[PDB]
Amino acid sequence: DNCTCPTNKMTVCSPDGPGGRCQCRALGSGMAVDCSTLTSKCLLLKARMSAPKNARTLVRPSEHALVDNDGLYDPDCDPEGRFKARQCQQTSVCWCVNSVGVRRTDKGDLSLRCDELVRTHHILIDLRHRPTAGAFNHSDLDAELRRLFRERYRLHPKFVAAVHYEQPTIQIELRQQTSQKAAGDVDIGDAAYYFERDIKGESLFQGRGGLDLRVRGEPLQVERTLIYYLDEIPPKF
Amino acid sequence: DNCTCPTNKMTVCSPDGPGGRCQCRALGSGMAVDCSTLTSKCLLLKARMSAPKNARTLVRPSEHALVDNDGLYDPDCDPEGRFKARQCQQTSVCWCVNSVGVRRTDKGDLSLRCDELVRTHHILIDLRHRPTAGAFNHSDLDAELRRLFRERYRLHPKFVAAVHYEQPTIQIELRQQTSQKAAGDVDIGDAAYYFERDIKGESLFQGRGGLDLRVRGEPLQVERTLIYYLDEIPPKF
Ligand SMILES: *[C@@H]1O[C@H](CO[C@@H]2O[C@@H](C)[C@@H](O)[C@@H](O)[C@@H]2O)[C@@H](O[C@@H]2O[C@H](CO)[C@@H](O)[C@H](O)[C@H]2NC(C)=O)[C@H](O)[C@H]1NC(C)=O
Numbered sequence: 384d385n386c387t388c389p390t391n392k393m394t395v396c397s398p399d400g401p402g403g404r405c406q407c408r409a410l411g412s413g414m415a416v417d418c419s420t421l422t423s424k425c426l427l428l429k430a431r432m433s434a435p436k437n438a439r440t441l442v443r444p445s446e447h448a449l450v451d452n453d454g455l456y457d458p459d460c461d462p463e464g465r466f467k468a469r470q471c472q473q474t475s476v477c478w479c480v481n482s483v484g485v486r487r488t489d490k491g492d493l494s495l496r497c498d499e500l501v502r503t504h505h506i507l508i509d510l511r512h513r514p515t516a517g518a519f520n521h522s523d524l525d526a527e528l529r530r531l532f533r534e535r536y537r538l539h540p541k542f543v544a545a546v547h548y549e550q551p552t553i554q555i556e557l558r559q560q561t562s563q564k565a566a567g568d569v570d571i572g573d574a575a576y577y578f579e580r581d582i583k584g585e586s587l588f589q590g591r592g593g594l595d596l597r598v599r600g601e602p603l604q605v606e607r608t609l610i611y612y613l614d615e616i617p618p619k620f
Numbered sequence: 621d622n623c624t625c626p627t628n629k630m631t632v633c634s635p636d637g638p639g640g641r642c643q644c645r646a647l648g649s650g651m652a653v654d655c656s657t658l659t660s661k662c663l664l665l666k667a668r669m670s671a672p673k674n675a676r677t678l679v680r681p682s683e684h685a686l687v688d689n690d691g692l693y694d695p696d697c698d699p700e701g702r703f704k705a706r707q708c709q710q711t712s713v714c715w716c717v718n719s720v721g722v723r724r725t726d727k728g729d730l731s732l733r734c735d736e737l738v739r740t741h742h743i744l745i746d747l748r749h750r751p752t753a754g755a756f757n758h759s760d761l762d763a764e765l766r767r768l769f770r771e772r773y774r775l776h777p778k779f780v781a782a783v784h785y786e787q788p789t790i791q792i793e794l795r796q797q798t799s800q801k802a803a804g805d806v807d808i809g810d811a812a813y814y815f816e817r818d819i820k821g822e823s824l825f826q827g828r829g830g831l832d833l834r835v836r837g838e839p840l841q842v843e844r845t846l847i848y849y850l851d852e853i854p855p856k857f
């Protein structure tokens with residue numbers, strides 16, 4: 384039936400529409416999905432944290448259990464798929480987040496109010512690949528990288544601000560102001576999240592398990608990944 | 621090379637000992653390694669987060685920037701390769717960690733004291749596999765996961781507490797309290813770390829290739845992984 388969501392396999396899809404139309408929904412949220420573009424980072428985080436409703440013979444994580452990524456959580460998303468500017472956990476604990484969903488203010492109680500969703504317009508991606516004889520020249524790197532950020536992540540070439548290379552560290556700087564973003568353009572935060580997941584081996588694409596990055600045909604593997612976010616307003620700590 | 625470190629490729633090994641003995645050392649720490657058994661998660665983190673700190677062609681994050689670290693950092697390890705109970709970053713931020721290195725207290729200053737290394741005695745590995753037409757035989761899947769932990773990660777069978785399956789979710793439940801671990805046992809936290817690295821396409825082995833999971837010969841592809849750690853003393857947030 385080929386009923387699939389190529390740009391998001393973290394979904395459920397079934398040919399049960401009128402005429403058998405393939406209908407799909409975001410796992411963990413029941414939100415709608417565009418199977419021909421990037422799904423917003425907030426819905427993807429909800430999908431990753433989704434619990435089955437009936438555990439059956441599965442067990443559930445203890446309330447006191449912890450996870451490696453201490454910034455990882457199940458988020459609340461608005462109808463357009465953006466993070467709600469105020470996020471909460473443990474019933475009362477509450478804080479504000481930016482457009483990428485990173486805590487930006489001191490934590491408080493339910494009385495906290497976040498004026499707006501501060502937009503992250505600048506993203507630094509620092510990759511440390513394992514040493515290899517292929518010191519692919521910067522030119523060939525920018526070429527496949529911008530190609531990927533345009534043809535895989537569907538981000539527009541101006542929003543790729545710059546790429547750097549000093550072995551064994553590759554660096555991609557992304558810039559997208561609200562003034563430069565036409566509606567229906569892919570946001571840099573979503574393409575950056577798809578990139579982070581492709582690097583770390585949990586690709587969100589259909590049939591792809593990770594980033595099969597090949598410059599001039601030689602595979603390149605990344606050891607360490609560090610991503611920094613710069614938004615319109617400085618964090619208020 | 622005859623001189624390799626099969627259980628840990630995050631090493632440099634040279635045939636420069638007496639007579640040509642393969643002498644190996646861990647990247648990022650200089651520590652000795654046992655290439656017949658799994659290396660400590662603390663030392664492997666030191667190998668993964670070693671920082672060149674070069675800025676000739678590279679740019680540094682803005683002072684106001686926030687970071688998605690995945691909770692990763694370069695940690696302090698004791699002579700036995702265990703995490704030191706106390707961990708610091710940015711020189712002044714400091715906290716306690718458990719035996720798997722996860723933060724189990726609120727961040728403090730350089731005055732913070734951690735009494736002991738709290739044992740992580742329970743681990744839950746929740747995999748979500750890429751859907752297939754039919755479910756795997758629960759007995760065959762259970763047997764393959766058990767021999768995987770017995771042979772590849774060299775974990776004793778008694779430390780695998782349970783294996784759950786409810787398509788498409790697989791769950792592996794490891795248990796190893798302080799009283800149940802004799803010296804020379806592989807630790808469940810290390811077996812879990814090697815498993816997670818294998819699944820994400822970053823196998824730690826030097827000559828076993830990679831993880832190609834096969835139940836009854838059918839490929840098993842993990843789309844999502846999540847790991848939960850439970851300590852013998854509840855976290856003090
Ligand atoms: C999963 O497989 C096991 C292993 O049996 C194999 O697969 C069977 C389909 C068949 O081809 C056997 O010859 C293979 O050895 C299944 O265990 C068997 O169960 C059958 C049916 O009840 C029983 O007659 C046999 O004694 C078992 N086979 C042996 C030799 O262990 C199991 O039932 C399969 N589960 C599912 C979900 O189908």
Ligand SMILES: *[C@@H]1O[C@H](CO)[C@@H](O)[C@H](O)[C@H]1NC(C)=O
Pocket residue numbers: 519520522523599
């Ligand atoms: C980079 O190196 C490759 C090696 O195959 C070569 O083909 C290419 O022309 C080089 N380009 C530059 C700009 O150095």
